[PDB]
Structure formats: C-alpha cells, structure tokens
Amino acid sequence: GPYHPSECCFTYTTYKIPRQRIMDYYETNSQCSKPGIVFITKRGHSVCTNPSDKWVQDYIKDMKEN
Amino acid sequence: GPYHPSECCFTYTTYKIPRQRIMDYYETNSQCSKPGIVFITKRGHSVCTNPSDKWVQDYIKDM
C-alpha cells in the first residue's frame, strides 16, 4: 500500500563489496536526503553505497541485462 | 552492518488504522527527514503515521 516507509542511506561504505557476496541491488527513493544504491548480500543484508562512486556504477553495469 | 539503510516515512496514512490490524510498531530512525511511527499489520503491511497524531500516541500507550 502507499504509506509504507522507504529505505534511506545515511552512511555509505567506502569499501568495494566483494562481488561474490552480491545478490542484487536497488536505488533508494529520491525522497531520501541522500542518493543511494543498496546492495543486497548473500546473508540477506543490505549495504548502502554512493551511486557516484565509479565501482558502484561498474557493478550495476555488469549486473544489468539489456 | 554499519552501512545498513533505515526505513523512513514520507507519505503518512490518510486514515486512522483499525486497531485490530496492528501487530507491532517501531519509531523510525531519528535521522529520517520526518518523524514517523510505523505500524506493522497482520498482513505484513507497514503503515507510516505521524507521531504528533493523538490516536497514534493512544495506540502506542495501549500496546
């Protein structure tokens, strides 16, 4: 329904996430105070990253299909 | 971990949630841009509410 909360990022990791841990990603709601790409990991955890970091962009490109 | 996202509220409910639906609640991270109380319903819906609403505080009190 339309009143659910949205996940927002407040602190980003500075460290590239080992690609073997990565299950998926999503972009955080633009209403959040900061931009965010959240990576979902094998153990079901969520890790905030900065979309403007080159490695985050590189990861997303290798994860996406055309 | 230290880099987990937090749930934040942007669109508050437009109705008083029937009490019977509610299983639990949590207050959102105070770092969110708006104050929020999220009620968790039986059916796994999370519903954002304004902690300044009397009915919300009344619910929390009773729970």
Residue B59 sits in a domain of what CATH number?
A: 2.40.50.40
Give B13 to chain A, closest Cα distance, Å.
Answer: 6
As given in the structure block, the two tokens for residue A37 are 């790409």
Residue A36 near residue A44, CB atoms below 8 Å: no
What is d(CA B10, CA A50) in angstroms, rounded to the nearest whole number?
Answer: 21
Instruction: List the domain range (segments joined by +) for residue B22.
Output: 1-63
CA nearest neighbour of A41 among A62, A18, A58: A18
Which chain A residues in 16-45 lie under 8 Å from chain B, judged by CB atoms? 28-29, 31-33, 36, 38, 45
Which of B3, B7, B31 has the CB atom closest to A5's CB atom?
Answer: B7
As given in the structure block, the two tokens for residue A4 are 């659910």
Residue A16 near residue B49, CB atoms below 8 Å: no
Residue B26 near residue B40, CB atoms below 8 Å: yes
As given in the structure block, the two tokens for residue A35 are 């931009």
Count of structural domains within chain B: 1
What is the 3-class SS of chain B, one letter each residue? CCCCCEEECCCCCCCCCCHHHEEEEEECCCCCCCCCEEEEECCCCEEEECCCCHHHHHHHHHC
Residue A9 near residue B8, CB atoms below 8 Å: no
CA torsion, ordered B31, B34, B38, B44, to nearest 10 deg: -90
Contacts with A22 from chain B: Cβ below 8 Å: none
Q: How far is CA A36 from each of CA A11, A40, B36, rounded to the nearest angstrom? A: 9, 13, 20
A14 touches chain B (CB under 8 A): no
The 3-state DSSP class for residue A56 equals helix
This structure's resolution (Å) is 1.8
